[PDB]
Amino acid sequence: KHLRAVKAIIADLVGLSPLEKRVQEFLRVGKEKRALKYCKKRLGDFTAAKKKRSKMEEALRHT
Amino acid sequence: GAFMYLNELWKKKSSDVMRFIQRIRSWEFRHQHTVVRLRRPTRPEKARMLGYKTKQGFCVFRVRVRRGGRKRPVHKGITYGKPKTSGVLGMKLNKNNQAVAEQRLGKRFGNLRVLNSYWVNMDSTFKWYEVIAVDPMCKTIRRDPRINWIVNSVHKHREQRGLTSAGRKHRGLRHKGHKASKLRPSYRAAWRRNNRIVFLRKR
Amino acid sequence: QRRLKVPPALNQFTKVLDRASRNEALKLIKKYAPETRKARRERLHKAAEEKKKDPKKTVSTRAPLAVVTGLQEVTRAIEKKQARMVVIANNVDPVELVLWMPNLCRANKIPYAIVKDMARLGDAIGRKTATCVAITDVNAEDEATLKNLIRSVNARFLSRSDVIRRQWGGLQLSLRSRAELRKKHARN
Amino acid sequence: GKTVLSCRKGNGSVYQVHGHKRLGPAKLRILDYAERHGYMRGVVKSIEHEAGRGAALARVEFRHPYKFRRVKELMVAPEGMFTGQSVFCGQKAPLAIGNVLPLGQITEGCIVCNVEAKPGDRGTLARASGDYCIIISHNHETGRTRLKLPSGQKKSVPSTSRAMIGIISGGGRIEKPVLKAGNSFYRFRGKRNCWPKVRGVARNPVEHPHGGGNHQHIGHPSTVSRHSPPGQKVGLIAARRTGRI
RNA sequence: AUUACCAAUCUUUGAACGCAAACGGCGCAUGGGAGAAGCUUGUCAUCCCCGUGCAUGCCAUAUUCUCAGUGUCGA
RNA sequence: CUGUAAACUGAACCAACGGGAUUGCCUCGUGCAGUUCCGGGUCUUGUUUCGAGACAUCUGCCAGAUGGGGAGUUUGGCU
RNA sequence: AAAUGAAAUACCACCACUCGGAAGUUGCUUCACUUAUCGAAUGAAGAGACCAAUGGGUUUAGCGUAGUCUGGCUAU
RNA sequence: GAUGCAUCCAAGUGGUGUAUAUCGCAAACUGAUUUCUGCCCAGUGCUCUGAAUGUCAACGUGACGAGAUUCACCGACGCGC
RNA sequence: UACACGAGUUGUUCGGAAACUGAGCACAACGUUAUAUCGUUUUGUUAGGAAAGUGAAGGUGUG
RNA sequence: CCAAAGAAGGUGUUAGCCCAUUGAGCCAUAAACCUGAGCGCCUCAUGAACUGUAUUAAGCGAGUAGCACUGUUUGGGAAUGCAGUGUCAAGUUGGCAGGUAUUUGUCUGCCAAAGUUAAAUACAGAGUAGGAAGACCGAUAGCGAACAAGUAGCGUGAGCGA
RNA sequence: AGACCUGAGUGUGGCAGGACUACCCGCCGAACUUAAGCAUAUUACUCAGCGGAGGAAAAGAAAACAACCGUGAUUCUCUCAGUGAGCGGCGAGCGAAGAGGGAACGAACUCGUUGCCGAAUCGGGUCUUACAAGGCCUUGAGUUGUGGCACAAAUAUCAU
Ligand SMILES: [Mg+2]
Ligand SMILES: [Mg+2]
Ligand SMILES: [Mg+2]
Ligand SMILES: [Mg+2]
Ligand SMILES: [Mg+2]
Ligand SMILES: [Mg+2]
Ligand SMILES: [Mg+2]
Ligand SMILES: [Mg+2]
Ligand SMILES: [Mg+2]
Ligand SMILES: [Mg+2]
Ligand SMILES: [Mg+2]
Ligand SMILES: [Mg+2]
Ligand SMILES: [Mg+2]
Ligand SMILES: [Mg+2]
Ligand SMILES: [Mg+2]
Ligand SMILES: [Mg+2]
Ligand SMILES: [Mg+2]
Ligand SMILES: [Mg+2]
Ligand SMILES: [Mg+2]
Ligand SMILES: [Mg+2]
Ligand SMILES: [Mg+2]
Ligand SMILES: [Mg+2]
Ligand SMILES: [Mg+2]
Ligand SMILES: [Mg+2]
Ligand SMILES: [Mg+2]
Ligand SMILES: [Mg+2]
Ligand SMILES: [Mg+2]
Ligand SMILES: [Mg+2]
Ligand SMILES: [Mg+2]
Ligand SMILES: [Mg+2]
Ligand SMILES: [Mg+2]
Ligand SMILES: [Mg+2]
Ligand SMILES: [Mg+2]
Ligand SMILES: [Mg+2]
Ligand SMILES: [Mg+2]
Ligand SMILES: [Mg+2]
């Protein structure tokens, strides 16, 4: 709750990685049935593919 | 606190800001010697958790380690016997770079008790680990019970024997359960244990 | 690090205060500097001398008034929002050790100040170097000089918060290899 | 089997250039400030004979531009250069036969020996005896001169390289026939240790890919691949045109 | 006195560490101690002994023991 | 205009100043004695100088070909 | 919910389209950089700069276009 | 033609020819003069070439299935010719 | 020339070293190596800060 | 004679008695090691009855875990551990482990990537110190060596070796 | 014309190397042999090789086992077990683990984080019977954090 703030202020200056940047590239123009094929090969397992693909579309409604 | 913010910058290690810092600092590292004495550690967050206090008798080194798989040393690149061992380039050395880094610093600086090390930078050629070392005879280290233990003589070259965390990594420790039934306490302690031919007196 | 494309987060430290109010900012930090191990040990000594002569239950003493000059003590002065405004050093060797400092400030709306030298935040305080000084509550002898300092500095860091976070630095070419690029537009 | 004589030679144990009666490496004077923004005169004092080279080496002294000494330079001697010639090697130098005026400043169609490929390496090309290069083309927009190496293979070098003017001394060495194995003995005893050449077809099939058989024949085609491993890359290496023309 | 036990002496080397090395060789400091010619009965000239110190690496450290840097800044 | 360019034609040599300032002096005209810059062209965000240059070579990876250069092993039975 | 051929509407979530224009990533790519990298030379022995869109921010001084902490100001 | 070629080394800003610079180096063959050195490029070799010639490597691209995976494709230099 | 006992080798200048360089070696450093006892190393080392030989003001017996 | 006849040895031959031993203790020895401290003080901290009252933020280790490859390792088999490269997290609305891969769920245990830690265990190598034993060998045996044995002697040497 | 940063130089105060290696720890690492051949395999994660400590080393305080009525650091032992596990040209061969009875065991702890503190720390002195679990002077390290304290929406923390 308070550590989460520390991970959103450090996520503010730092910006998004070359994954999360290139993920939301797909997720910005359809490509969502394969944005998780990208953030699965790159990001290891497949349960953490959604929790980040769901976190970049939750980062797109917040432009 | 102060730690929460440095610890989270380094977890976002691939961003353009942290990767700029690493692109310039991986560049001075490539014009310094393999082993380099530092005054302060580059990562106080990651050093102070690995057992580094900024007292006297504590010293930090960058050690450079060439990347990539070890190549078997056979004359002319020729290996003999069974083709099990035919490969010359694809062996992997069964000891991670961080252990090799920690052991470079030990052969050189015999008056120091290496304690830990951590990742500082890697380019596509080299890889720098900052190895946290202790002067076991600075009076500060002597009279401080948090780190007296390393003055005792069983810790002279814990780096050379795989007693550091990096060594405890490639020793298959750090898995305790059914995952290390032959790893415990060591590859041979288990090997001696399973392959002794025990002879009870009364059989 | 002048050639490269300095990110808009690390650039923040190459747009420091000017010498106009920087000496003023070092004036406050200096007179509200901590006690130097000699007025510290004889301060808590009068906490026994006039307490051993006191009847009982009266030794109450604290730091008279100073600026929060550590790093993890400053960070808490910000998180608590009790630091009225914080001063930050231009350069610290693991630059990431203070990189995030000017960004949890406008998170908690503290006026921050990236100032030109940590070696000049040490001479005021007393140490050799200092990564960041925080100037919390002050006595009414000096609410005038800082109340303006907060204004003179957020006009440079908080008012600029939008353009700061979108500001790529560097790309500053040589005087040798960019006067060449002047002698060819001379050929135009 | 065993390693082959050619492979067993980059170890450089015995098969290593001798050079004890040799003078230093013969090369142009170092490309300092003086040979860029002017010239400097230098007197040729001694023309010696480095054992193992057909070209005369001329000991040229210059003055050290910065200290007070007289620095001494060993250079290969262009033919005609005699003792006491007052050689100029700079930018504004004249183009007499022996001077080292820069390559893009020499007139075109001229004759230059001891040219240097990179601007500063102190003379590499056209430096054996009688060998030389002809300047063909300057490209002042690119700043690179195309000179014709003494092998027909004409290349392009930068117009700031340096180059002597003339032909390297000792020309016509290769035309006097040796007439005896003993005059080949004394040629290579100043050079490295490769003489006599035993034919690989007269060797045993352990020491060379050609050796073996009841007859002295190369069993498989002599032309070997460019990519072939060392110890196999023997014979006509990547021969693209083969045999008498 | 012999025996037994428990503070010394402990040559030349050797990790060997002043340099070297098929040299019982060669120095640099630093004392002191011989020997003497001159010289003022003694006093230190080269010569010659004795002893200490002097290897590299590393750590700590020096009442403000010295420094380098177109690293940082300021008077 | 806009740039460092004061030099041998068959063996010579060139390396530690002139002036002005600063302090007293035989003083302030003249000077004897420490000192400072000038020049023999002021600053450089600043690479030692070039040259190539995000291409390379080759840093590391994998991949495909090639590969007696080399290794290991084999090279049945009958009669 | 009446009311059409070879096709059904106002409280509108939205997959309903040959093209038109920039944005934004991306490859393809040459153009110029240089700072990494590379090679060479060198006892690292003289590198570029008169000179102003050349950029530096130029402690500045204004002009719009602005954004504001909402008298500090900056950004373009 | 030197960021070369031949080559060493377990690896390295390592080493050899090379203190060299095509009148050179490396690599073969034949074997002094003289005299000639014929025909055969199918083969197997070297060699270039690859526009188109025929085909391939992970990588990269796509669609499939909830997902492991499937089905592709880029046919790309190479390898065929 | 065996065995035993006893003796016997005299240096300012002879040879050697102190004191040269050659073919070459390789301590250091540096690099590499799991690892070094590996490699580079006088035709001059080392990403490389590698040294009292001299000249001096001042100190000192004493009119 | 025996709380002593085996700590079974010595002595000119087979010894309980000739000698040395050995015993249950004592002058106890320094009480310089420590046995509970019987202590002894000089100082030093730190233990309770408490008046009022707060901590709150929970967070708890990143080129790490994981994944992909390919190399090794393992009984570990759609990976047991490791290594290398590419990739690279999550945050207790969690992570890992629950020996068949995958997705979707539940449940159970646990909380990696920091550190120390006795004992039981291995070893007769320094026998270092001290030993004690044997259905062992008995001088071609037992260690190579019962003795001036790693010796003499051999080998350029590594070594060999009576 | 000075601080700081990054480096030097010698002065002091030290340390490291070497020996030993039976056991132990890390890396490296075969082959003969077995498979009636042999290349997977086996030998063997062995010998040799490099390195490093100790009187033991190592391990060790659960990111453990289990699936039960649950167990509770490591190590060792008997046992599970030459295994109706399993790996394996599924051949030769290989091959553990939980549980159980034990030995041992007054065995647990401390950093970092977190919160509250913020130099109470460290080192050079000095003073005391050497008292450095302390006194009192010290910029000398240190604020780029030494040190102190607390352990959970549940407690009681916290000061006289
Ligand atoms: Mg150093
Ligand atoms: Mg260092
Ligand atoms: Mg250093
Ligand atoms: Mg650094
Ligand atoms: Mg320090
Ligand atoms: Mg341990
Ligand atoms: Mg077990
Ligand atoms: Mg052959
Ligand atoms: Mg052949
Ligand atoms: Mg020595
Ligand atoms: Mg000390
Ligand atoms: Mg000083
Ligand atoms: Mg400076
Ligand atoms: Mg046969
Ligand atoms: Mg005799
Ligand atoms: Mg060596
Ligand atoms: Mg008897
Ligand atoms: Mg945890
Ligand atoms: Mg196996
Ligand atoms: Mg890995
Ligand atoms: Mg995960
Ligand atoms: Mg699971
Ligand atoms: Mg799932
Ligand atoms: Mg779920
Ligand atoms: Mg732990
Ligand atoms: Mg006998
Ligand atoms: Mg640094
Ligand atoms: Mg310093
Ligand atoms: Mg010393
Ligand atoms: Mg050594
Ligand atoms: Mg040792
Ligand atoms: Mg067999
Ligand atoms: Mg095995
Ligand atoms: Mg062994
Ligand atoms: Mg232990
Ligand atoms: Mg059994």
Ligand SMILES: [Mg+2]
């Ligand atoms: Mg096995």
Ligand SMILES: [Mg+2]
């Ligand atoms: Mg039990």
Ligand SMILES: [Mg+2]
């Ligand atoms: Mg702490």
